[PDB]
């Protein structure tokens, strides 16, 4: 399944949900 960070105008695509979540940590999650 193709993943994409739709956070504002970020727009980065991943092939793993663990990777998208990892990336998402840059914007939010544990901040
Ligand atoms: Zn992002």
Swiss-Prot record:
Record-listed Phosphoserine modification sites: 17
Post-translational modification: Phosphorylated on multiple serine and threonine residues. Phosphorylation is coupled to ubiquitination, sumoylation and proteolytic processing. Also implicated in the repression of RECK by ERBB2.
Transmembrane feature ranges: none
Outcome of substituting residue 15 to A: Abolishes PRKCzeta-mediated but not PKCdelta-mediated phosphorylation. No effect on DNA binding
Tissue specificity: Up-regulated in adenocarcinomas of the stomach (at protein level). Isoform 3 is ubiquitously expressed at low levels.
Induction or repression: By insulin.
Subcellular location: Nucleus; Cytoplasm
Summary of the function given for this chain in its UniProt record: Transcription factor that can activate or repress transcription in response to physiological and pathological stimuli. Binds with high affinity to GC-rich motifs and regulates the expression of a large number of genes involved in a variety of processes such as cell growth, apoptosis, differentiation and immune responses. Highly regulated by post-translational modifications (phosphorylations, sumoylation, proteolytic cleavage, glycosylation and acetylation). Also binds the PDGFR-alpha G-box promoter. May have a role in modulating the cellular response to DNA damage.
Domain remarks in the Swiss-Prot or TrEMBL record: The 9aaTAD motif is a transactivation domain present in a large number of yeast and animal transcription factors.
Note: In the hepatoma cell line Hep-G2, SP1 precursor mRNA may undergo homotype trans-splicing leading to the duplication of exons 2 and 3.
Complex and partners: Interacts with ATF7IP, ATF7IP2, BAHD1, POGZ, HCFC1, AATF and PHC2. Interacts with HLTF; the interaction may be required for basal transcriptional activity of HLTF. Interacts (deacetylated form) with EP300; the interaction enhances gene expression. Interacts with HDAC1 and JUN. Interacts with ELF1; the interaction is inhibited by glycosylation of SP1. Interaction with NFYA; the interaction is inhibited by glycosylation of SP1. Interacts with ATF7IP and TBP. Interacts with MEIS2 isoform 4 and PBX1 isoform PBX1a. Interacts with EGR1. Interacts with SMARCA4/BRG1.
Family membership: Belongs to the Sp1 C2H2-type zinc-finger protein family.
Name of the protein in question: Transcription factor Sp1
Organism in which the protein naturally occurs: Homo sapiens
